[PDB]
Amino acid sequence: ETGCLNGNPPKRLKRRDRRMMSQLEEMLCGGFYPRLSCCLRSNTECGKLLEEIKCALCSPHSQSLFHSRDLVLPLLCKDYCKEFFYTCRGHIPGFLQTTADEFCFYYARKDGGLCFPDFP
């Protein structure tokens, strides 16, 4: 069930809509969500991972992902949470004071349902 954080449904990028985007110079997390996005209407290893999590707001399932340290993160997948923790351990402060199992118990989903990354 799709839905955005503002309480409105995601927006579809049609045939006429994509022809405009192709002529403009790429934008609004197109690489992860080109067709259905919530951002349409209203260099290090850790950096790339933070850029992905930044794009979780544009996800057509952003409402389901963000709503269940004071760290605002979407419900991550078991493998990705573990990956993000170790890659951003020296860069994010509180990460060195905890373990991967402890961090992913509160920030990752063990249910087996929808989790971030949405995209493959």
Ligand SMILES: O=S(=O)(O)OC[C@H]1O[C@@](COS(=O)(=O)O)(O[C@H]2O[C@H](COS(=O)(=O)O)[C@@H](OS(=O)(=O)O)[C@H](OS(=O)(=O)O)[C@H]2OS(=O)(=O)O)[C@@H](OS(=O)(=O)O)[C@@H]1OS(=O)(=O)O
């Ligand atoms: O032609 S469009 O598909 O681009 O739709 C044009 C505008 O329709 C609204 C409001 O409806 S209206 O008042 O009757 O004009 O929303 C409609 O579109 C979304 C899907 O997004 S999409 O990219 O426009 O296709 C529907 O949501 S959902 O079915 O995917 O859940 C809306 O359904 S609903 O209101 O949530 O029930 C649908 O409305 S309706 O069924 O046609 O009535 C506008 O969206 S709005 O600006 O957020 O109010 C669209 O305007 S827009 O400028 O293209 O954004």
